[PDB]
Amino acid sequence: MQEHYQPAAIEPAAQKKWDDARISNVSEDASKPKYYCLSMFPYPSGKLHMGHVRNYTIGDVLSRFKLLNGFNVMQPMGWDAFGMPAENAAMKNNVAPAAWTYDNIEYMKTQLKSLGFAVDWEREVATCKPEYYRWEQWLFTKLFEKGIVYRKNGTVNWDPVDQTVLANEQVIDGRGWRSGALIEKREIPMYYFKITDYAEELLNDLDKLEHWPEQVKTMQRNWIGKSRGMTVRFAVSDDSKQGLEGDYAKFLQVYTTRPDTLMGATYVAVAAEHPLATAAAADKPELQAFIAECKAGSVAEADMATMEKKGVPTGRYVVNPLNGDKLEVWIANYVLWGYGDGAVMAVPAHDERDFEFAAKYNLPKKQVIAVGDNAFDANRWQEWYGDKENGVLVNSGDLDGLDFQTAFDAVAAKLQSQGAGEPKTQYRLRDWGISRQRYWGCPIPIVHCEKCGNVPVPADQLPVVLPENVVPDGMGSPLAKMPEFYETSCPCCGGAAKRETDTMDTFIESSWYFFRYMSPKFSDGMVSAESAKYWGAVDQYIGGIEHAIAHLLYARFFTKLMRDEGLVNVDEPFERLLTQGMVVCETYYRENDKGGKDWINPADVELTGLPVVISGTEKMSKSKNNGVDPQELINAYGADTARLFMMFAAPPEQSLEWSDSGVEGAHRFLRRLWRTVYEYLKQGGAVKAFAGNQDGLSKELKDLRHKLHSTTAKVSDDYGRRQQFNTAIAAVMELLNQYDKTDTGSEQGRAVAQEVLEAAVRLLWPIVPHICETLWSELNGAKLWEAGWPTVDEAALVKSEI
Ligand SMILES: [Mg+2]
Ligand SMILES: [Zn+2]
Numbered sequence: 001m002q003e004h005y006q007p008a009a010i011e012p013a014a015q016k017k018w019d020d021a022r023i024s025n026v027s028e029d030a031s032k033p034k035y036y037c038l039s040m041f042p043y044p045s046g047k048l049h050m051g052h053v054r055n056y057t058i059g060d061v062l063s064r065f066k067l068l069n070g071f072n073v074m075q076p077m078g079w080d081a082f083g084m085p086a087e088n089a090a091m092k093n094n095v096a097p098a099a100w101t102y103d104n105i106e107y108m109k110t111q112l113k114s115l116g117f118a119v120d121w122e123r124e125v126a127t128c129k130p131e132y133y134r135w136e137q138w139l140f141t142k143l144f145e146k147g148i149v150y151r152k153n154g155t156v157n158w159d160p161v162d163q164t165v166l167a168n169e170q171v172i173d174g175r176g177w178r179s180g181a182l183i184e185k186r187e188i189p190m191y192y193f194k195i196t197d198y199a200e201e202l203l204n205d206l207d208k209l210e211h212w213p214e215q216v217k218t219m220q221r222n223w224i225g226k227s228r229g230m231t232v233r234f235a236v237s238d239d240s241k242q243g244l245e246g247d248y249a250k251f252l253q254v255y256t257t258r259p260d261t262l263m264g265a266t267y268v269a270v271a272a273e274h275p276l277a278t279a280a281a282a283d284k285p286e287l288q289a290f291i292a293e294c295k296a297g298s299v300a301e302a303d304m305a306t307m308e309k310k311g312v313p314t315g316r317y318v319v320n321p322l323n324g325d326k327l328e329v330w331i332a333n334y335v336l337w338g339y340g341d342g343a344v345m346a347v348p349a350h351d352e353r354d355f356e357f358a359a360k361y362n363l364p365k366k367q368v369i370a371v372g373d374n375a376f377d378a379n380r381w382q383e384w385y386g387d388k389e390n391g392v393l394v395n396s397g398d399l400d401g402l403d404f405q406t407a408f409d410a411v412a413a414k415l416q417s418q419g420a421g422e423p424k425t426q427y428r429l430r431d432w433g434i435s436r437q438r439y440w441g442c443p444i445p446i447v448h449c450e451k452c453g454n455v456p457v458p459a460d461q462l463p464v465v466l467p468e469n470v471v472p473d474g475m476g477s478p479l480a481k482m483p484e485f486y487e488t489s490c491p492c493c494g495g496a497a498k499r500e501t502d503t504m505d506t507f508i509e510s511s512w513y514f515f516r517y518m519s520p521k522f523s524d525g526m527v528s529a530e531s532a533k534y535w536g537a538v539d540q541y542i543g544g545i546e547h548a549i550a551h552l553l554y555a556r557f558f559t560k561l562m563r564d565e566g567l568v569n570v571d572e573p574f575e576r577l578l579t580q581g582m583v584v585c586e587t588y589y590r591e592n593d594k595g596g597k598d599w600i601n602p603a604d605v606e607l608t609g610l611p612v613v614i615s616g617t618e619k620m621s622k623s624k625n626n627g628v629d630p631q632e633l634i635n636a637y638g639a640d641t642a643r644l645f646m647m648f649a650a651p652p653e654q655s656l657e658w659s660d661s662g663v664e665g666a667h668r669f670l671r672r673l674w675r676t677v678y679e680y681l682k683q684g685g686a687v688k689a690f691a692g693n694q695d696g697l698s699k700e701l702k703d704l705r706h707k708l709h710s711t712t713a714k715v716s717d718d719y720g721r722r723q724q725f726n727t728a729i730a731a732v733m734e735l736l737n738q739y740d741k742t743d744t745g746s747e748q749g750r751a752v753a754q755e756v757l758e759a760a761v762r763l764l765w766p767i768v769p770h771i772c773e774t775l776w777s778e779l780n781g782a783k784l785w786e787a788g789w790p791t792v793d794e795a796a797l798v799k800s801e802i
Pocket of ligand 1: 208
């Protein structure tokens with residue numbers, strides 16, 4: 001055993017030892033209890049970043065802990081290979097996105113192997129391979145026939161200069177992000193998952209997830225946005241029917257979640273496309289300009305809750321069916337055509353968005369709810385104005401005194417008996433659009449034929465292979481300009497036809513990869529029946545916060561989809577969720593030639609020859625060039641120091657502040673662990689660890705065993721229930737300090753020192769397995785993973801009798 005700790009010598013050997021023993025190459029073995037630990041698979045962007053290293057070290061700590069406790073642990077790895085960065089890199093460097101993607105994969109794989117993650121590489125998948133995406137094309141065809149996938153027109157944002165479709169995040173002030181050209185809204189046919197058919201299932205099955213964080217469950221309920229409300233019809237007044245046809249000449253229909261405030265409505269509002277807006281704007285050019293300013297804006301929910309809510313009066317009037325009040329119709333920029341009826345009622349006294357709208361335009365505010373002895377101020381909002389659990393009605397005629405629920409049914413009965421309304425349930429959830437006007441993605445298995453229409457490709461002819469000999473050029477998606485791809489025969493009649501050139505949303509590949517890992521070489525289906533039944537569902541999921549709500553919701557959706565097709569038998573994919581905090585770092589800038597700044601990577605900076613300004617700390621990003629390359633951390637201190645610093649500097653949910661001093665401290669603790677064992681072996685070699693009855697031990701050795709087994713208990717709880725690995729490292733450190741302070745020179749003293757060290761190297765093996773595997777083999781000849789997790793000796797926790 002070498003005196004000094006040298007990670008470059010031991011980490012390659014420990015990895016070859018785990019690979020030769022195939023400790024993490026697991027199969028469907030019904031003898032050991034299964035455990036599926038899943039970390040979110042990475043996009044192959046070129047090389048790992050610090051967020052990758054933290055995510056996969058967390059997942060490896062949890063996997064190695066469960067392995068040491070006797071579980072059949074599956075920790076698979078794979079590559080989320082589709083998406084825009086390969087397409088952008090293809091244009092910047094004139095290479096094929098596939099070649100760019102496969103090069104990044106082979107390099108990033110060696111980086112992951114160099115970190116010693118106990119990963120079943122026999123289950124590796126790359127989603128850009130036909131071996132993978134043929135199965136999401138398969139499910140597509142199956143759901144297309146059943147109607148769960150359907151084709152319908154939808155409005156996108158067309159950049160006429162870049163000749164490409166833009167995401168709303170890429171539209172700034174009505175113009176394209178990279179061109180500045182005014183976007184044009186275009187109606188094109190696109191494909192959708194009828195996810196609204198599963199809204200109730202997606203909401204109620206959250207009750208099964210006893211171990212999910214409540215806020216994550218709350219965020220899924222707000223996205224779905226279920227409400228039980230009331231459809232209400234306001235009859236159009238006799239003086240307001242000009243230009244109106246059909247029912248729009250008869251009544252104005254609205255949806256409301258507060259029909260117990262119907263007596264308090266003071267005006268109504270309609271979308272800019274509502275026929276009442278069309279008819280009223282006919283002879284009024286101010287309303288025409290307002291309708292156009294609405295129709296040329298962004299409808300994104302982010303760009304709607306932040307926007308100035310504005311409106312214009314129309315001069316048309318409708319009648320409140322419950323009290324005969326004559327209410328004016330306004331056009332409003334927050335009412336959206338396509339969300340329900342395209343019209344709403346406004347109760348400024350009990351809706352904060354209506355309160356602010358009415359305060360702006362001096363519209364009336366009619367209190368119809370009372371809460372205790374609270375005074376009502378019509379010029380200042382209070383949160384009790386919106387109170388529903390304690391609301392008693394006032395100024396409501398024969399409804400005064402009722403609470404929310406009995407006023408709801410009273411109003412329902414009143415409206416229904418006169419035909420002017422009925423209860424209704426709605427969801428904010430929209431159908432999932434999966435058409436992408438992009439090349440580097442999974443082709444949509446639709447063939448367009450004039451005789452037969454939109455026809456799905458037969459299962460025999462799957463996959464529809466995306467050609468990889470393509471370099472995109474940024475003037476439209478390449479597939480649409482490639483006849484050798486889209487020219488084909490119709491599968492129903494054999495005549496000339498045209499393939500779908502759009503590709504799928506990449507959220508699709510991430511919605512089911514956790515099932516493909518169970519049998520990634522299976523060629524008869526998405527997932528083999530045997531392997532899906534054994535592995536069941538993901539026991540632990542570790543990932544990031546970016547796009548998490550949509551990713552989770554989509555993966556739950558696909559699970560129920562695949563279950564109903566007979567592929568899986570579980571209802572929910574993820575039993576536990578751990579979202580890691582970001583990794584932050586300081587920023588450094590130097591002013592520009594004309595009132596600006598410029599940021600430089602921290603590695604290329606002289607800390608403590610020109611002076612550079614130390615700015616502020618933020619997430620490691622290319623925006624201010626503060627991303628510390630993890631490869632330079634590995635080369636400098638070894639993989640164990642990299643893993644130790646990430647697990648020690650912060651709890652996994654908390655943000656982790658990069659510290660050069662922190663990394664040095666981590667590496668210095670590893671040398672201490674190494675030197676602690678070495679000095680122990682050079683003073684007599686190894687012995688049999690202490691075990692059994694502990695009476696007759698000295699007061700000092702008894703206390704060391706108490707600290708030992710109390711530390712084992714703390715580390716177990718930190719790994720198993722708290723998932724707080726930083727305090728677990730702190731615990732082992734405290735045990736080592738008590739060790740150093742203890743005379744372990746006697747025969748029984750060495751037996752206790754052996755037990756202290758044999759436990760310490762096993763308590764830290766999930767965090768730093770290279771040095772722990774190496775130190776363990778110098779103390780003990782048995783296999784570490786068969787010695788298992790250190791057990792708690794409760795007899796050593798029973799203090800003396802005084
Ligand atoms: Mg349960
Ligand atoms: Zn045909």
